[PDB]
Structure formats: structure tokens, C-alpha cells
From a paper:
BMP-9 and BMP-10 are TGF-β family signaling ligands naturally secreted into blood. They act on endothelial cells and are required for proper development and maintenance of the vasculature. BMP-9 and −10 are synthesized as pro-proteins and processed by furin to release growth factors comprised of two cystine-knotted protomers that can covalently homo- or hetero-dimerize via a single cysteine in the dimer interface. Unlike other ligands of the TGF-β family, BMP-9 and −10 are secreted as a mixture of disulfide-linked dimers and monomers, in which the interchain cysteine (Cys-392) remains either paired or unpaired.
Hence, purified BMP-9 disulfide-linked dimers were crystallized under neutral pH conditions similar to those used for the cysteinylated monomers. The first fraction of this single crystal analysis had too much free cysteine to model the disulfide-bonded conformation, so datasets from nine crystals of BMP-9 disulfide-linked dimer were split into 8, 16, 32, or 64 parts, and the first fraction from each were combined. The interchain disulfide remains unbroken in the first fraction of the 32 and 64 splits, but is broken and the cysteines are free in the last fraction of all splits. To model the intact interchain disulfide, we inspected the first fraction of the 32 and 64 splits. In the first fraction of the 64 split, automated fit functions still placed the sulfurs beyond disulfide bonding distance, but a manual fit to the omit-map density produces a perfect syn-periplanar (0°) χ3 dihedral angle Cβ-S-S′-Cβ′ with full occupancy. While the observed χ1 dihedral angle of Cys-392 is both an uncommon and high energy conformation, the χ3 dihedral angle (Cβ-S-S′-Cβ′) of the Cys-392-Cys-392’ disulfide is an extreme outlier as the χ3 adopts a syn-periplanar conformation placing the Cβ atoms directly across from each other in the same plane. The intrachain cystines have no outlier dihedral angles and all disulfide bond distances, both inter and intrachain, were acceptable for this resolution. The interchain cystine of BMP-9 has one of the highest energy conformations possible,, yet this is the dominant conformation prior to radiation damage. Analysis of the BMP-9 disulfide-linked dimer structure revealed a highly strained syn-periplanar interchain cystine prior to radiation damage, and an unstrained free cysteine after irradiation.
Author numbering:
A (entry chain A), B (entry chain A): 325 to 429
């Protein structure tokens, strides 16, 4: 039950972006969920600082928070958007929209 | 009160690393602390996914967790360590030990 990519389907109208995004209506953003506690998995790929903070958090749980399961690499998607003039326009690689990799940081 | 680098002084014996680290006894690791909620600061430098997840978390706080204030760039330190033979040896750039930048991810 450690840090990993799980599914997260995002509807653009729900987050108030339908005003400038015609299509798609929903996309697969994924999310990173899970713990960063010891012992770790063989593919968490954690930084030295995340390891140190996890140890410090264990010894002082009230003073220092835990490390975090976050996206460590993102992928683009394509969106059809009405530009400032108002015409549908394709953005082929809308960067940073979907999780490619998760990790403890 | 948004995501920012705050101080975190780490003692190597407290985290059980004194067995292979002779010096220094403590170092300044810093940590990233604060919220990732709207409105954001001019220097959070958040990814598109962190922005999307924050919106989804606002609309569905029980199903989707918040974005995270984590280190986005790390700096090295120097440590004196007894090697596998047992002699003090300098590691000049022990990478990923201290926070250089924080951000919402
Ligand atoms: Cl481990
Ligand atoms: Cl590292
Ligand atoms: Cl593009
Ligand atoms: Cl291409
Ligand atoms: Cl982009
Ligand atoms: Cl904002
Ligand atoms: Cl991005
Ligand atoms: Cl080095
Ligand atoms: Cl150098
Ligand atoms: Cl290193
Ligand atoms: Na949604
Ligand atoms: Na949905
Ligand atoms: Na404590
Ligand atoms: Na292509
Ligand atoms: Na400590
Ligand atoms: Na200390
Ligand atoms: Na909810
Ligand atoms: Na140098």
C-alpha cells in the first residue's frame, strides 16, 4: 500500500474550465496515492531528503511532517480550446496534465 | 501561509546514521511546508496537474486529496563517512540532502 499511480477521471466542467475547453469533456489525469513510510518498495525511487524526513518524522511525529506521494513525471494531453478570438483551436501537447510516475518527495 | 522552505535541523544520530557518518553531527536539511490552496502565490510554480487536483479536491474533498508542498529541487552536502574498510572518507557532493526550492505538486 505504498506510493503509486491510481486512477483519477477529471471532468472539465466540474473544475470550471468548460469556458475555455470545448473538448474532451473528461480526461484521465491519474493521481499519486499511498504512504512513504519504511520499509519502501523497490520502485518508489525516493530522494535522500524524503528518506531523511521520513526518519525525522518517525522520531518526532508532532514537529515534522511526513514525506509525500506526489507525481514525479507528467505527460501532456490534447485539448480543443476556443482562443481569445473564439475559434476552436487544437493544443496538441498541453503539458503537465497526466501523471506518468509517482514518487515520495 | 502558502508552500515555502522552512528550517529543519537534522541530527544524524537521531535518525540512526551515526554508524556510517562521522561528521557533521547535524546539518540543515530544510523542509517544504504550507498549503497548495487557491489563490496561489506568484512563486509557487505549480504544475498543471497540481492545479487540476486542487480544483477536484475542492469540489470532492472526500474522494480526492490535495496537492502537496514538497521539495522541487535539492542541493548536496559534504559528509565524512567511514567506508567499508573503516577509514574516514570525504564525500564532497552527497546529493539530494537539502531543499533548494519548494513547490506544489
Ligand atoms: Cl527501506
Ligand atoms: Cl536524491
Ligand atoms: Cl502543442
Ligand atoms: Cl509530436
Ligand atoms: Cl502546454
Ligand atoms: Cl491563483
Ligand atoms: Cl506543468
Ligand atoms: Cl562528491
Ligand atoms: Cl565542485
Ligand atoms: Cl550522492
Ligand atoms: Na471532476
Ligand atoms: Na468525474
Ligand atoms: Na514529537
Ligand atoms: Na505525436
Ligand atoms: Na534530528
Ligand atoms: Na535537532
Ligand atoms: Na466529496
Ligand atoms: Na566546489
Amino acid at each position: 500500500s505504498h506510493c503509486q499511480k491510481t486512477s483519477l477521471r477529471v471532468n472539465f466542467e466540474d473544475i470550471g474550465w468548460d469556458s475555455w475547453i470545448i473538448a474532451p469533456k473528461e480526461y484521465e489525469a491519474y493521481e499519486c496515492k499511498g504512504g512513504c513510510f519504511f520499509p519502501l518498495a523497490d520502485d518508489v525511487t525516493p530522494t535522500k531528503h524524503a528518506i531523511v524526513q521520513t526518519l525525522v518524522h518517525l522520531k518526532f511525529p508532532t514537529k515534522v511532517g511526513k514525506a509525500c506521494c506526489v507525481p514525479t513525471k507528467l505527460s501532456p494531453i490534447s485539448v480543443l480550446y476556443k482562443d481569445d478570438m473564439g475559434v476552436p483551436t487544437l493544443k496538441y501537447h498541453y503539458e503537465g496534465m497526466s501523471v506518468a510516475e509517482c514518487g515520495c518527495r
